[PDB]
């Protein structure tokens, strides 16, 4: 694509500059270009990829919710047309990320840390597609998210300690998937509670810095449990 002529290292450097400038669409385009170089990504580069697209899709999700709410209240074609425009752009971003993951980030990821990271992303972006999906395509999209999250969970439980931040963030997101996408609030609560309690029991093994990383995500699990129970 349009980043084919730029050095991988230059694309990474510009992604970091774009982050500092809060230019997340640019950041995502630079990271897409870095991924398309074909080399595997480091932990820092995976985080740049994820942060960029999370910010882009986050703005789209927030806009879509505003428009959907106005549309529901209003039920001319303009509200529906514009909600559809935003929805299509959101779906396009999800498809782009899912495309990077299947071609070929996931299949080239052999280490637990990288494979879990990417499968969690696959779950997340199918989850964002599910949020806007309506009907049977909705069922298939939900199952795709579930499958990705479940495979990530299986690997993380076998290969990572219970305080691992990637493992914790995965469980957090899968529990939110259960609560409001799969309409399984009890599964959500059970997952969040077990994850929190097993991490709690492992905190004594950690350095001050790792302790801070793990407790930050545990607090998000607690935040959700407080709202759900």
């Amino acid at each position: 694509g349009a980043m084919g002529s730029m050095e991988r290292a230059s694309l990474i450097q510009k992604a970091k500059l774009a982050e500092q400038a809060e230019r997340y669409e640019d950041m995502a385009a630079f990271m897409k270009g870095a991924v398309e170089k074909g080399e595997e990504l480091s932990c820092e580069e995976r985080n740049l990829l994820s942060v960029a697209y999370k910010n882009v899709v986050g703005g789209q999700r927030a806009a879509w919710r505003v428009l959907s709410s106005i549309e529901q209240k209003s039920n001319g074609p303009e509200v529906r047309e514009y909600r559809e425009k935003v929805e299509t752009e959101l779906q396009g971003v999800c498809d782009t990320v899912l495309g990077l993951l299947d071609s070929h980030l996931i299949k080239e990821a052999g280490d637990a840390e990288s494979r879990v990271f990417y499968l969690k992303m696959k779950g997340d972006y199918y989850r964002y597609l599910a949020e806007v999906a309506t009907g049977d395509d909705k069922k298939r999209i939900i199952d795709s998210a579930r499958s990705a999250y479940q495979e990530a969970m299986d690997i993380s439980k076998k290969e990572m300690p219970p305080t691992n931040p990637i493992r914790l963030g995965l469980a957090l997101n899968f529990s939110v998937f259960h609560y409001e996408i799969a309409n399984s609030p009890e599964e959500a609560i059970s997952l969040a509670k077990t994850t929190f309690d097993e991490a709690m029991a492992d905190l004594h093994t950690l350095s001050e810095d790792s302790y801070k990383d793990s407790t930050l995500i545990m607090q998000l699990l607690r935040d959700n449990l407080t709202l759900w129970t």
Binding site: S50, K54, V57, S69, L170, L172, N173, N224, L227
Partner: peptide, 12 residues
């Protein structure tokens, strides 16, 4: 809509 906590930047 009430959004629950998920991982990473709270960008929505």
């Amino acid at each position: 809509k009430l959004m629950f906590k998920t991982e990473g930047p709270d960008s929505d």
